[PDB]
Design a protein around this nucleic acid. Structure first.
Lengths: 142, 56, 20, 117, 103, 150, 110
RNA sequence: CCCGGCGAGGGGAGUGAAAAAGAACCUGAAACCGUGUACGUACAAGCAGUGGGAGCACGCUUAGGCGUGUGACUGCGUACC
RNA sequence: UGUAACGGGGCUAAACCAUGCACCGAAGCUGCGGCAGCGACGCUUAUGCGUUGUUGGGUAGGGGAGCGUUCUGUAAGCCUGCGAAGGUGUGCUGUGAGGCAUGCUGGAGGUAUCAGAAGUGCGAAUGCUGACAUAAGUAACGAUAAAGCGGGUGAAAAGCCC
């Protein structure tokens, strides 16, 4: 009847490192969200923090196929006037490749606080270099 | 205008956050007047740095 | 400790109908 | 034979208000808006009373899923293995026993992978 | 320390020597009632079974009283109507103390 | 009401109250919509229910042996210390002292002590039998009690 | 010591008297008396009189020191409101209150 | 008697069985408004509660993993007539 | 008004069609514990019981059962100053209305049980009265005929007296 529960001292947070080259857009993000949600590990449940750090490599070589290299719309609106700020996969890569992963995870994570804690766990970089190897990411490129 | 709706108690104490008098640490001492006086003004016996201004 | 208080009943209307 | 309406007013109120504590602002203070509150309160209790056995029957399923995933098979394939095993269904709540002993859970897994097979 | 068994409207794991308060079944205060519908053994020695039932073991336990439930207030209410019903329910309970897995 | 019809608004134009009156019953003055007055509270009850009662009630004291026929319980003089001993010596209290017979010193003396009141055979009713449990009557009283009732 | 202090029927705007409890809440005596007399408000010289009287009982009524008195609790409670009327205008009058307080100083031990 | 303006008012001191019985005086609720203590709360949107539920203070749960108070977070949930 | 003619992310199969298998999913259905209504069957007598069937979403509406409050009767009876009612907290309890026990306050009356009668139960009527909020320390402080100084008194003077 009565259960184990999570506590943020009874979940040991972990460093993982995930590919991006052979990986494919939104199908990399479901791997992020998956891990984030704590259904890759022993737990109680998502209902408190279940995040656990995880790091993409590039964000430039994530495949978007031919027909969304063509145009995948991304919308944004600034709440002013006529508004509207529009970018494509492409214009994003111009302008911080990182964003094609931040927007992906955002709408695959609920509301504010626990997605916003669970933004902090995921890191986003452009280029496959490591730059934080010192807090021992352990392989999970797979 | 004429308001609508009843503000909550919270919303009162929230405005009254900013309401209060500045604690100047009013009392102060000169070596010309050891009195316990408000600085940059009268000591209550006319002095300011010494020198009686008062005749009343 | 005297008290005197009445009630009021006079109009606050002055404004005129819309679209007859 | 004038009846003064007991003290029965703010005595039957006195119940509600004491069972209506803990509430931010006038939600508890005011008798009107601590009665249309008390209604809604009970309504939810009664609502969620059944939602208990939903939200747990999500919580369980979730975690049985993760467990088995890491090991071998999927959720679908698993559960249909406690089934195919017979009296050892083990419920869904108590299908999870992996919290303090993963290998306790893992035995069912392996046993069930062969029942399926 | 697991071995689940039919407790009727529920089933329950074994906690060994530690009291459990469960849904009322039957039996007057005092007296032992045994659950030989035990259908898993894995008491930390990792003695798995997968088959229907455990033949030859019981889960023994002593009833240290039974009693009524506790009240929670049942309103069935429909707004815009004229309808409320208030209703009290408090259940009943069997307690076990547990002494089982005895061969 | 001691009020009047004076109207505390001059129709709509203002919204202090929809009431036209200070002779309303919902007012501070009040009025009350179904105000008390003279009302009847007397019931018929047949003469054969009346007798009917005092016959079942009679024949209930008998089954509960508490009906006492003792004679010459009349008192010689106003002095209630004689009407004390009359009950006491026969180990009675809570009495009616009910007889059709006429002794006025007996009616007078019965008035003091509120565990006994003046009762007569011809004056007979239920409630008085029922409360004042011992029931005291002369041989003559019963003989008359028959014709009066049944 | 422990002594209370009330000036009941203080005519004074009560939201304003609340402001000046805070001003010297728990900051010893013998400088908390000085501040009031050299700051703003005539609420200052109304709670001031209550203050030096609380002290004076903490003297004479047991005590002998202002050296070991801290103004532990100081509040002010809403006092009886003085009902009046305002001819507001255009045949409308309103009960207009001369709002009031019970100035309460409570000095204790330091 | 004391503070204060031979103030008001209050505090003491006695009166009294009681003065939270002190004259606005019986008992003095409730709304309303404070003060203290414990706990919570300053990146998070919505009938503000409810189910789950972490952490914390208390009663230690006075051996026991519990109760009381609170409720981060999270699943629900559009007031009443 | 801004994607807003996939819920959204996102997706090139996670789409779409066909087939098949598995699982999820409700207050449904089943399990378990417990309740009540009617019908029936046995036991059995105002009787009431057990057994069993089945039923129990519910406004308008009809019927059927009760609680409580104030009073009168049962009451110079009972309870109570070794502390009633009411107020204010808790535990226990009942299907519920509620009740019961009890701590604190309080300083006196209150009333088992059963029955009788009602000004008999309140959130709503721009209800009514009374109390106190709210906007708020906001608006305004009643003339655009300006006051300023120095004395005086008094505890305190911009406004008063001179």
């Amino acid at each position: 009847m009565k259960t184990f529960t999570a506590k943020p001292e009874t979940v040991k947070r972990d460093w993982y490192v995930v590919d991006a080259t052979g990986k494919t857009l939104g199908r990399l993000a479901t791997e992020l969200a998956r891990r984030l949600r704590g259904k890759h590990k022993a737990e109680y449940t998502p209902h408190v923090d279940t995040g656990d750090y995880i790091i993409v490599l590039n964000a430039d070589k994530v495949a978007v196929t031919g027909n969304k290299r063509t145009d995948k719309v991304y919308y944004h609106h600034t709440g002013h006037i006529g508004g509207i700020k529009q970018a494509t996969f492409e214009e994003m890569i111009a302008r911080r490749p990182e964003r094609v992963i931040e927007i992906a995870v955002k709408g695959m994570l609920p509301k504010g606080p626990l997605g916003r804690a669970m933004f902090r766990k995921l890191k986003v970089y452009a280029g496959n270099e490591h730059n934080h190897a010192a807090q021992q990411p352990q392989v999970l490129d797979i | 205008a004429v308001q609508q709706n009843k503000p909550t108690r919270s919303k009162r104490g929230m405005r009254r956050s900013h309401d209060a008098l500045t604690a100047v640490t009013s009392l102060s001492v000169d070596k010309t007047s050891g009195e316990k006086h408000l600085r940059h003004h009268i000591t209550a016996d006319g002095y300011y740095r010494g020198r009686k201004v008062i005749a009343k | 400790a005297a008290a005197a208080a009445a009630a009021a009943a006079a109009a606050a209307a002055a404004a005129a109908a819309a679209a007859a | 034979a004038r009846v003064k309406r007991g003290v029965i007013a703010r005595a039957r109120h006195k119940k509600i208000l004491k069972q209506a504590k803990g509430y931010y602002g006038a939600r508890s203070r005011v008798y009107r808006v601590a009665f249309q509150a008390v209604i809604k309160a009970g309504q939810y209790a009664y609502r969620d009373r059944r939602q208990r056995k939903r939200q747990f029957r999500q919580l369980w399923i979730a975690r049985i899923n993760a467990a088995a995933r890491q090991n071998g098979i999927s959720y679908s394939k698993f559960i249909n293995g406690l089934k195919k095993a017979s009296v050892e269904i083990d419920r869904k709540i108590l299908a999870d026993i992996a919290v303090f002993d993963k290998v306790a859970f893992t035995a069912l897994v392996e046993k069930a992978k062969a029942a399926l097979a | 320390m697991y071995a689940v068994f039919q407790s009727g409207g529920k089933q329950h794991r074994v906690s060994e020597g530690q009291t459990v308060r469960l849904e009322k079944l039957d039996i007057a205060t005092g007296e032992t009632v045994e659950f030989a519908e035990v259908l898993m053994i894995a008491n930390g020695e990792e003695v798995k079974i997968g088959v229907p039932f455990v033949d030859g073991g019981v889960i023994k336990a002593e009833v240290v009283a039974h009693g009524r439930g506790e009240k929670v207030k049942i309103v069935k209410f429909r707004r815009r109507k004229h309808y409320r019903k208030q209703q009290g329910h408090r259940q009943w309970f069997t307690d076990v103390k547990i002494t089982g897995i005895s061969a | 009401v001691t009020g009047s019809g004076k109207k505390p608004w001059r129709q709509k134009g203002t919204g202090r109250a929809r009431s036209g009156s200070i002779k309303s019953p919902i007012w501070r003055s009040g009025g009350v919509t179904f105000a008390a007055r003279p009302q009847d509270h007397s019931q018929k009850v047949n003469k054969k229910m009346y007798r009917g009662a005092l016959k079942s009630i009679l024949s209930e004291l008998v089954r509960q042996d508490r009906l006492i026929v003792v004679e010459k319980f009349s008192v010689e003089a106003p002095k209630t210390k004689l009407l004390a001993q009359k009950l006491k010596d026969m180990a009675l209290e809570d009495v009616l002292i009910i007889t059709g017979e006429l002794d006025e010193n007996l009616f007078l003396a019965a008035r003091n002590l509120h565990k006994v009141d003046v009762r007569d055979a011809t004056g007979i009713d239920p409630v008085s039998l029922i409360a004042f449990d011992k029931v005291v009557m002369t041989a003559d009283a019963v003989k008359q009690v028959e014709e009066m009732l049944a | 010591m422990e002594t209370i202090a009330k000036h009941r029927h203080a005519r004074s705007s009560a939201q304003k008297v609340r402001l000046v409890a805070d001003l010297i809440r728990g900051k010893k005596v013998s400088q908390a008396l000085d501040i009031l007399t050299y700051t703003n408000k005539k609420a200052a010289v109304l709670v001031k009189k209550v203050l030096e009287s609380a002290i004076a009982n903490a003297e004479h009524n047991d005590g002998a020191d202002i050296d070991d008195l801290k103004v532990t609790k100081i509040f002010v409670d809403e006092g009886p409101s003085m009902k009046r009327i305002m001819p507001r205008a255009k045949g409308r009058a309103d009960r207009i209150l001369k709002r009031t307080s019970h100035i309460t100083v409570v000095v204790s031990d330091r």
